[PDB]
């Protein structure tokens, strides 16, 4: 199935005009464990934001605009990128807003990392109904030597 | 010679334990390029945050409490930290807090990065008299989709 994974700050803020204000190695860690060995779908701005193709995953970039990298699979439509992942147990949608927005109704599971970071949001996560999903996992953590903010890892499943 | 390198926030606010609330890759590039192939002195709090020894740099941790590792040099004092590096041209004192004020008096160069991160903290980078330190290099930068904040690189010769 399709699952979306995201790091939402307060008010579902998932993105700024610039980089996000924090150093969260742990969530990059949590992010990888969950996407590793799966096809990842992202938009050209998430693509261009990461910089390099994620190792050990198949990258599918969605954009009605033409491809600029020989190493990644590019796509022009939603249903098109779906086929690009092929035959797989799960697909991970990494973002952002439009990608989440379009895929969400096809999403059967969630991977929310909640961060106590009040920031002014350029982009936000589609309002996910609090009773259309069940929490099957949650783990809370405080900021430590390497992470700037408190966070709570959480996976949800559609009801 | 003893040079100190640090990244500051408004009003000279520096890390204290948990990681700092920003994401600045250029400063780590700047940091590395200036500290590499050189002996770097640090306190215990910084060392946890780095979480491992710096590559191509002789890492010296200054502490009174038992050096819990056998890869890095652990010293108990300042005159003792100094020797650990031998006779090299430059010794970088990377911090933090306390480690900074114990070493500024012997210093002759400052490697600052002034950040537009309005952070609250208790530790301050030692107050430097600008009629005792001449500014030489100074280059401003804008925040981008990779660097979360605006920042300025600066170099102060001691005068
Ligand atoms: C734009 N970007 C955003 C990114 C980060 N965390 C998320 N976290 C969640 N929970 N969801 C997302 N969609 C998400 N996206 C990035 C940036 C770097 C890497 C990357 O190199 N990270 C690790 C490696 C960690 C490292 O050494 O930098 C990886 O291999 O997945 C991935 C995504
Ligand atoms: C917490 N910490 C202390 C730290 C961080 N930024 C600073 N920035 C400046 N200007 N000055 C300092 N004294 C300083 N100290 C760190 C954290 C990570 C690395 C690090 O991972 N290594 C860098 C960069 C490595 C990389 O980007 O791959 C390096 O010097 O090799 C260094 C210092
Ligand atoms: Ca339950
Ligand atoms: Cl995008
Ligand atoms: Cl310390």
Curated annotation (Swiss-Prot), chains A, B:
GO MF annotation list: dihydrofolate reductase activity; dihydrofolic acid binding; folic acid binding; methotrexate binding; NADP binding; NADP+ binding; NADPH binding
Residues binding NADP(+): 7, 13-19, 45-46, 63-64, 76, 95-102
Further information: The strain K12 sequence is shown. Strain B [RT500] is resistant to 500 micrograms per milliliter of trimethoprim.
Effect of residue 154 to Q: In strain: 1810
Effect of residue 16 to F/S: Increases catalytic rate about 2-fold
UniProt keywords, alphabetically: Antibiotic resistance, Methotrexate resistance, NADP, One-carbon metabolism, Oxidoreductase, Trimethoprim resistance
A biological process term (GO) from this entry: response to antibiotic
Protein family: Belongs to the dihydrofolate reductase family.
UniProt: substrate binding residues: 5, 27, 52, 57, 113
Tagged with keyword Lipid metabolism: no
Catalytic activity from the UniProt record: (6S)-5,6,7,8-tetrahydrofolate + NADP(+) = 7,8-dihydrofolate + NADPH + H(+)
Lineage per the UniProt record: Bacteria, Pseudomonadati, Pseudomonadota, Gammaproteobacteria, Enterobacterales
Protein name: Dihydrofolate reductase
């Amino acid at each position: 199935m399709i699952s979306l994974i995201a790091a939402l700050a307060v008010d579902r803020v998932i993105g700024m005009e610039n980089a996000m204000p924090w150093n969260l190695p742990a969530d990059l860690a949590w992010f990888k464990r969950n996407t590793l060995n799966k096809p990842v779908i992202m938009g050209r701005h998430t693509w261009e934001s990461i910089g390099r193709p994620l190792p050990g995953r198949k990258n599918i970039i969605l954009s009605s605009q033409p491809g600029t990298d020989d190493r990644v699979t590019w796509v022009k439509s939603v249903d098109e990128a779906i086929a690009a992942c092929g035959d797989v147990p799960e697909i991970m949608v990494i973002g952002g807003g439009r990608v989440y927005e379009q895929f969400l109704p096809k999403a059967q599971k969630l991977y929310l990392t909640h961060i106590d970071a009040e920031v002014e949001g350029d982009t936000h996560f589609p309002d996910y109904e609090p009773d259309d999903w069940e929490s099957v996992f949650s783990e809370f953590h405080d900021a430590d030597a390497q992470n700037s903010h408190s966070y709570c890892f959480e996976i949800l499943e559609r009801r």
